[PDB]
Design an enzyme around this catalytic site. Structure first.
Site, short mmCIF file in Angstrom:
data_model
loop_
_atom_site.label_atom_id
_atom_site.label_comp_id
_atom_site.label_asym_id
_atom_site.label_seq_id
_atom_site.Cartn_x
_atom_site.Cartn_y
_atom_site.Cartn_z
CB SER A 7 -0.96 -0.02 1.21
OG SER A 7 -1.84 -1.13 1.10
CE1 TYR B 101 -15.68 0.09 -8.38
CE2 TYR B 101 -16.35 -1.74 -9.77
CZ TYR B 101 -16.51 -0.43 -9.34
OH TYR B 101 -17.50 0.35 -9.88
CE1 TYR C 69 -0.83 -4.80 1.31
CE2 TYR C 69 -2.12 -4.81 3.34
CZ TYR C 69 -1.31 -4.15 2.44
OH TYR C 69 -0.94 -2.85 2.70
CE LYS D 252 1.29 -4.44 5.55
NZ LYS D 252 0.19 -3.51 5.39
#
Lengths: 298, 298, 298, 298
Positions: free
Chosen positions: A45, A108, A134, A163
């Site tokens: 990110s 999305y 993630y 994560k």
């Protein structure tokens, strides 16, 4: 257990033209390795993956992996909305010599659970590389629950960690109990600085957090202290880590903050961020400085 | 007022290798024009923009605009998370002869308001073409409020409408009052089938909704009845439109449902959908069929 | 099918001492009966039930039932967080002459599904009267889903309806299909003015909405036109109902707006509302008046 | 700084008739004082305030205050939805001999910011006693933000603290910075066990959490070790507090669990809880026991 300890989500350094700044990115990688981190995660990110195209992501991963030159473990974030592209990026990372991939859920459409399990099994099957999940539900709108992660770990032996990016003791505790109870060597890393100490005390494995970039010594030293059995020392570092995230409120996205913090903590790089992110103004840059001051980070 | 009336979010038809099926998507375009639609929107959510790469999106836009050959107004959805690419896609659409672009807010990071305004002003400034905003907060996790839309309409004369995709009478009513009160010719289109009648009664402009693909006549006939002053006949069609959305529950994403409905309502095309979406199973296909038959749509 | 049509959530009129205004509440009740409403619902949300104690609530219900004197069906809202108090208030309502009770889910703790079912089963078992459920998730933080409502209707034969207070076509459509599919005479009433037309078109039964207090004729005339098969005429009334809810934005809570609208529309009563609600200021009253004027309601 | 340290939300002990068990409650109170808590909070969430009426609440408060007989500071939870009732209960608490009141925001209507400020200002003006705010947004649906709390502290000098009940490092950190930066002796107490250590390290003041009932020594010993500068010894207790909250998952609401844990840990009382809570089953009581075993709490 793979990919344990302090694994910063490395900033991608760009020039003012918005091109990969190779000298700057290389200098950051080298600062990090020397600071004693346990690996490096590119194109998370904070690495700005969602603002880059497929071919830019490939060129960056290749440069980053080559520069690390196997000094520490390298993770590449290959996720997105376009599943065919995720596979392409994942196969490229394996070919380019990455040691693992980090895969966010599609953000999305929040895809049915059947489609979600199918998606992760397909990308896991596309590579021989270890896969780290993630979870960042503030961005994705779709939590990877401890039960779903256990289901994925059960299904594919190369799905080997997560994560978990969430301001929640409960979610971390429940992630560790459910998934590590079934799979003792599955690795759980928190995604926030201020949860690293609790993550370790809970039985988890470390952190992939922003402050790894500009104040790596704090997380590195906390981990060492914890592993040395020196819990008071670890808690001293945790007290700093508790206060760091104030700086992230300075802008949204705060990738600009992280790079400005790198500069203020003694590494001159260009701090260019890709749209829709924007440069951090002088007032908030000053504010960042006083926060780092006040924490003796610079 | 630009882009008023019934403007379907056209499905992109793919072959089983996931390549643009040209005969199939041409056939669909031609069905829709003949059914009397007021424009066509390619590469919306139902067009699968988020599962396609930039170069795929360009070649599809080109093929679609060309095939329409100016018979109706053509909109291209150019948005994403990568703002440089949005500008690239927006400039390509203008260059390729599109009549407008539709731009969703970035849906990974939910960017600060200052960054959001800046983003929309930058893409609006990148083209000389009209811009339609795209609100879909169930997917984006960030609502475009009526106050924000009004600010944008005030700032840029080419920001001239919105596709407002929300199950909410309040949001629509407030969008019309706030923005059209300031800008009488700003276009508000709902994104759901079952709000088209309300949108019209509220003083809004039409719909960009999935049933435009397989039951265009219902929407086209509602609008014709409304404009003719025949409100009982419009409400007759509304009753069918109220029931259609049951089918969208069949799968998530439900782009597979929409394509299967095109087939069942009389147009033979590949159904292939891009990952992470997956084929609709025979059971839910049979359910779709009885629903469409139910509503006298096939 | 019990409690169908137009059933206003009657405002409780209070003197400035915070006591029940009997003449004022009486006058409101009589206006509403004369307007041709199908029933009256006392001590709903707009009735200020959560700002009253158990003994005040018993006094109000008694006064209200006696004054109606069986000329229309009467519902009493008996819910809260104290389940012992719910049973007490529900049994008192039957003893006082009420025709049914309306019970909201507990709205402090969002209790487990097992506790929730048990709660609704115990209160339904405490009385021999028809029980209407009350869904208001914006306030409760716990949606009563169509599936759960169906489970409750399956379980207890005196659980015979729902006031579904939500700005959602899907929730109303799905409540109708799921519950009325299994229980044809289960009553579904929308809680919002602007959903009445759609509720009737979906196969639901009517509305319990705030505008029944100050503009009962709009809903009464809509329902009558619809039952006469004059859909065009019904849709004309629906166009007013679409617009009315902009007044509820003038304050939160907006019971003050509803009482101020009652006065503006020709029935002088105390406006007093109980703490923590407060008087509507003069500027907002002036805004309300121009709205009512506007919609030719006064 | 008032009401710092460890202040249990005392369980209310009821006989099976749903009446105050005075010997049971008195025995619990005495165990807690003997364990060295810094104060006692009656009629909090875990004290079942929302399942009790005004006169029951007055009788409980009076009994509790008298039994404590000034040995430690006493807080009474006086909030609800009925603001007139809040004032009554708040004034009764001062009259009965309480040292402070704890007031939750109204939790049915999420009242406007103006109404909310007015509410807290008027309850704080009804007493000359110190007033603690109570934030619990998972239940209330309306967060008391650090900025609002600072506004209230600025407005009324007897608004002197907050129970901040949230699984959030950020909310606690930001509460401490904003409110204690303007008001150095404003008290911040976390509502969760697993945030006590973080709260102290951040510069906050202690905790009001459920485990103070059955494991008071853990928190008491944590606070003492911290004040002694023995951080390693504090962290050891924190590791227990990290793990305790898995027991609260056994039911919703989980007041039953807390009372069963009190019994399991050495103090036989009625476990009776008030509807719509219910008895904890035998399987779940066994689960609870093995959790307490495994943490050496019994």
């Amino acid at each position: 257990a793979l990919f344990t300890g302090i694994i910063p989500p490395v900033s991608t350094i760009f020039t003012a033209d918005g091109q990969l700044d190779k000298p700057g990115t290389a200098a950051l990688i080298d600062d990090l390795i020397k600071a004693g981190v346990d690996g490096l995660f590119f194109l998370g990110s904070g690495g700005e993956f969602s603002q880059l195209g497929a071919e830019e992501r490939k060129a960056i991963a290749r440069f980053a992996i080559d520069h690390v030159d196997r000094r520490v473990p390298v993770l590449i974030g290959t996720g997105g909305t376009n599943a065919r592209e995720t596979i392409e990026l994942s196969q490229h990372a394996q070919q380019a010599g990455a040691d693992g991939i980090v895969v966010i859920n599609p953000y999305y459409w929040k895809v049915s659970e059947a489609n979600l399990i199918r998606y992760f099994e397909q990308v896991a099957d596309s590579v021989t590389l270890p896969v780290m999940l993630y979870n960042f539900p503030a961005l994705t709108g779709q939590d990877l629950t401890p039960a779903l992660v256990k289901t994925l770990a059960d299904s594919r032996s190369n799905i080997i960690g997560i994560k978990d990016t969430i301001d929640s003791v409960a979610h971390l505790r429940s992630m560790i109990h459910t998934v590590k109870g079934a799979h003792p060597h599955f690795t759980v890393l928190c995604g926030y600085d201020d949860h690293l100490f609790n993550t370790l005390l809970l039985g988890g494995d470390g952190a992939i957090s922003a402050s790894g970039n500009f104040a790596p010594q704090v997380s590195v030293n906390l981990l060492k202290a914890w592993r040395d059995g020196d819990v008071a020392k670890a808690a001293g570092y945790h007290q700093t880590l508790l206060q760091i995230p104030q700086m992230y409120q300075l802008d949204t996205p705060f990738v600009n903050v992280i790079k400005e913090a790198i500069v203020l903590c003694g590494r001159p790089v260009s701090t260019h961020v890709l749209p829709p992110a924007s440069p951090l103004d002088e007032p908030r840059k000053a504010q960042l400085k006083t926060l780092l001051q006040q924490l003796k980070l610079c």
